[PDB]
Amino acid sequence: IETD
Amino acid sequence: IETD
């Protein structure tokens, strides 16, 4: 996944 | 036209 990609956060932020 | 139509107002309001």
Add this chain to the structure above:
Amino acid sequence: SGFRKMAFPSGKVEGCMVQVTCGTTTLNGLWLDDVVYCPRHVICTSEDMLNPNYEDLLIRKSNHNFLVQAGNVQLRVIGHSMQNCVLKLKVDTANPKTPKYKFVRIQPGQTFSVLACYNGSPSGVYQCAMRPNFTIKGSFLNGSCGSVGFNIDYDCVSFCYMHHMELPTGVHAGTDLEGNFYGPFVDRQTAQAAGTDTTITVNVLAWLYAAVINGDRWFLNRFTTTLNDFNLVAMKYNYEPLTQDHVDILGPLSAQTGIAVLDMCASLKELLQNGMNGRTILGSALLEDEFTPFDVVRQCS
């Protein structure tokens, strides 16, 4: 990654919205400092709207004919005047929530947020474009009159639109906050054609850049074009001609993607001539023209 039509946060405009009543007409007003801006047609009966003399009709009105309500508080009107098609009511209190603001006339094809209000009460916020023919494809119900369009420019609310009326097609016409109509419209009951509603080519190009930035690339071809030859095809499809200045404002996105503006123009030329073949771009089956180059730059980093 994800791309969406977005309005400016509305909080700063919410705290400027008021109710204005005159006889049995209630619509919205914009309370900045001690002045309430609203459409002047608020002073008219249905009979007046057939051939209004607004100067004569307004002279016959006094302060107490104007009921302003900011929440459940009633504002005291100490003056009523006219600038073009906007009524200005002067009032005894300066709006505590008065933000830093400015009045701007926008260009055909520019975008702005509408805070849709009913009886002085904020109901909804949506993003739209000034059409080439100076109409707004808005969502407005009876009592939506006096709802305003704006951009937020750093700290500064730039008011650019006030809603006045609906044309027989359901499109919306209105003024800047100096009370001049966008387009050839008049605040009276007479036949009034909007022009041909053309597609905002420079906005489609921005959106195709958006599509590239977000990994939709299928419509990119190896072809190229001149600005003259692109405009030949554009004219045929009811697209606005592209100007050197359009190319200029697209420069930032050309730079970010590495796709020359006229190459992107060549891709659009081909979509126009051949359609999408049942494919979609950023989830749409139609080419979207309500995103300016700045809109895409703003959202895409």
Add this chain to the structure above:
Amino acid sequence: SGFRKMAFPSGKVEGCMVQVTCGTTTLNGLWLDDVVYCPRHVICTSEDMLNPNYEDLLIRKSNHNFLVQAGNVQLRVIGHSMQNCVLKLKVDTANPKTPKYKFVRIQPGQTFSVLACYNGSPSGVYQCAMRPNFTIKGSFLNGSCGSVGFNIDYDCVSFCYMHHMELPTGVHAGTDLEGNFYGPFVDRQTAQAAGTDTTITVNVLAWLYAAVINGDRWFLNRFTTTLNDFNLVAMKYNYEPLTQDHVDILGPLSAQTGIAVLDMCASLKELLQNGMNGRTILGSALLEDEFTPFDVVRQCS
């Protein structure tokens, strides 16, 4: 007349948004009363995100590891705890702008407004739906984490979503404000498939009612159907099955237009089987599924 996707006015949420920093991670927090809600993944290094033990990682953190900023003011953190996947920071000041609010879990297919924020600063407001598969087709840039979804219910801000993360397709996953994920997602770097993204049938039907209310009628046919036979065709096209309770919530619009729900179901059946033949409904070339029955009722009077 005019029909538009609209967000709730955001002012009440704008005055709840804050910056939260932990090490070199900055994202958004929601400051209600004296509590700051944000995603707990704010406490993780890139190495931690491979197999985080959040209990162990949070114990190793102290109050002063959390930098909260409300404008250019820095909030004093006097407590840090965890509810499910949301960090709660307790702070020494109750939010003066704290509105009347509530925490609600929404149903797949329900809609809500996202106030997209960057570094604690409101950037944009857009309307979207919780997809059947519990993802959000959002517009989120790095630092959009902690941005919230809400409805305004009379006076009451109903918070229903906080953004946590993006999946490889660019769709967005997050939690309610009790920190439970919508869908089968986990706040760690592991393979995580969303289900099949089906079309929200009850929302399409509402939108076709919207289209009728606004004088788009071309797709109305003389045919009818049963709820079972409609769902046979729906299943084939990746449409969610329609339930008796869906029919129930459509009742108000059935009443307003005079078109029985199963008659509107018969019209949709035919569009699915035959397409639009290059025609549009309310300006769209695709069937729109991000308007609930309540959304249409709200906008259409």
